[PDB]
Amino acid sequence: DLRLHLLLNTSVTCNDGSPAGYYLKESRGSRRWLLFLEGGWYCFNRENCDSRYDTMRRLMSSRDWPRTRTGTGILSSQPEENPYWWNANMVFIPYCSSDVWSGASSKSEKNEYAFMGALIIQEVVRELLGRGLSGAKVLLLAGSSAGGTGVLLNVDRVAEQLEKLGYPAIQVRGLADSGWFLDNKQYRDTITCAPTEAIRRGIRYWNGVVPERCRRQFQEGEEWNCFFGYKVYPTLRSPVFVVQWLFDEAQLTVDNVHLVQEGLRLYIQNLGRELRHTLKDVPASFAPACLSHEIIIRSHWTDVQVKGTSLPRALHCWDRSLHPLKGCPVHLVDSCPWPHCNPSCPT
Numbered sequence: 001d002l003r004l005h006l007l008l009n010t011s012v013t014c015n016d017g018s019p020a021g022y023y024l025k026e027s028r029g030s031r032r033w034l035l036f037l038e039g040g041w042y043c044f045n046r047e048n049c050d051s052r053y054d055t056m057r058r059l060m061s062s063r064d065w066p067r068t069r070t071g072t073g074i075l076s077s078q079p080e081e082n083p084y085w086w087n088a089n090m091v092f093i094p095y096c097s098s099d100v101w102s103g104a105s106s107k108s109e110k111n112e113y114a115f116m117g118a119l120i121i122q123e124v125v126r127e128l129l130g131r132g133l134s135g136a137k138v139l140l141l142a143g144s145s146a147g148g149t150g151v152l153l154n155v156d157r158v159a160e161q162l163e164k165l166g167y168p169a170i171q172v173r174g175l176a177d178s179g180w181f182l183d184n185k186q187y188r189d190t191i192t193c194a195p196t197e198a199i200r201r202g203i204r205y206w207n208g209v210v211p212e213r214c215r216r217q218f219q220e221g222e223e224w225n226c227f228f229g230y231k232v233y234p235t236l237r238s239p240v241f242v243v244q245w246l247f248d249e250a251q252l253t254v255d256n257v258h259l260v261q262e263g264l265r266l267y268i269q270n271l272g273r274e275l276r277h278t279l280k281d282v283p284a285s286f287a288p289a290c291l292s293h294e295i296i297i298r299s300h301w302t303d304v305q306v307k308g309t310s311l312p313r314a315l316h317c318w319d320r321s322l323h324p325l326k327g328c329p330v331h332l333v334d335s336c337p338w339p340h341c342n343p344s345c346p347t
């Protein structure tokens with residue numbers, strides 16, 4: 001189990017002003033550190049966030065968090081469950097800022113809620129440096145869904161933080177799972193019906209921050225562009241491995257697709273082709289032709305394969321590449337055009 005630590009700086013808070021925190025399992029024989037960002041959509045105005053506080057309060061508050069959590073998937077210490085990094089130091093950072101990990105705004109006389117996701121990541125890193133992270137060789141910032149987009153928004157800031165604090169030997173890398181979306185035409189709840197508005201409004205509500213090189217490309221008012229992987233990824237300097245199902249369930253929900261006649265068949269095939277196209281120049285990626293959402297902390301994440309290579313193997317090959325490799329690929333994108341045309345897709 002990973003044990004809870006509430007942040008010592010109690011001014012870095014979840015939405016309702018309670019302290020943020022992290023769950024930690026130390027591995028003193030390892031110089032590898034995995035920091036995983038939880039997902040779970042977001043909220044973008046007073047009324048929307050009030051609803052989330054009634055029925056999704058663990059995503060807005062630490063008041064009811066458990067003492068411990070079990071590591072699963074890439075967070076498991078069992079080699080049978082985690083062929084990739086079973087001996088690493090494991091950190092789970094709960095998502096309690098409702099801001100896709102972008103916010104830097106405190107509660108105040110003018111703000112009902114605090115949106116501090118970007119500052120929560122900075123403070124966790126900061127406090128871990130006193131608990132052994134100072135001796136790390138690799139810091140892998142990973143995350144799923146909104147946490148996967150959060151990796152893209154924060155990996156270069158963590159790298160800059162560690163350089164400025166005097167730790168230039170720690171190699172910062174990112175792993176973004178199910179956080180790579182298309183701002184495409186829909187097939188036919190504002191957060192699902194009108195996604196780009198929801199992001200634009202959220203950024204202003206959260207005082208949200210995007211990576212500087214991307215911000216400079218799109219300029220004032222157009223920061224929402226940097227929440228889309230194919231637009232922010234080319235501006236990043238840290239190595240980033242991208243995991244994305246080609247027919248992602250959250251993408252299809254936003255597109256108003258529910259599972260088929262010709263119009264919908266053509267729409268679904270075109271979505272796979274467009275996602276494939278955006279990954280063509282991403283050298284470290286894993287994109288199976290399946291209808292699903294998230295993978296890296298699922299216990300059976302070992303089962304899916306692309307061209308005969310599993311995701312744990314592809315990540316191991318990526319480690320080797322950062323020291324093409326014969327028999328050990330890092331770029332794995334399905335070419336077949338319909339969900340579950342890959343036999344290893346999950347049921």
Ligand SMILES: *[C@@H]1O[C@H](CO)[C@@H](O)[C@H](O)[C@H]1NC(C)=O
Nearest residue numbers: 008009010011012119120123
């Ligand atoms: C605690 O965090 C807040 C928000 O980032 C910051 O203003 C303050 O300086 C921090 N306190 C300490 C002692 O680092």
Ligand SMILES: Nc1ccccc1Nc1ccccn1
Nearest residue numbers: 041043048051052189191192
């Ligand atoms: N934005 C929000 C806040 C409170 C309750 C529901 C929603 N809507 C929603 C739609 C799809 C997936 C998750 N949430």
Ligand SMILES: Nc1ccccc1Nc1ccccn1
Nearest residue numbers: 149181182195227250251254
């Ligand atoms: N979930 C989704 C799917 C397809 C298009 C837009 C969204 N919205 C979104 C919100 C924050 C960050 C990235 N995307």
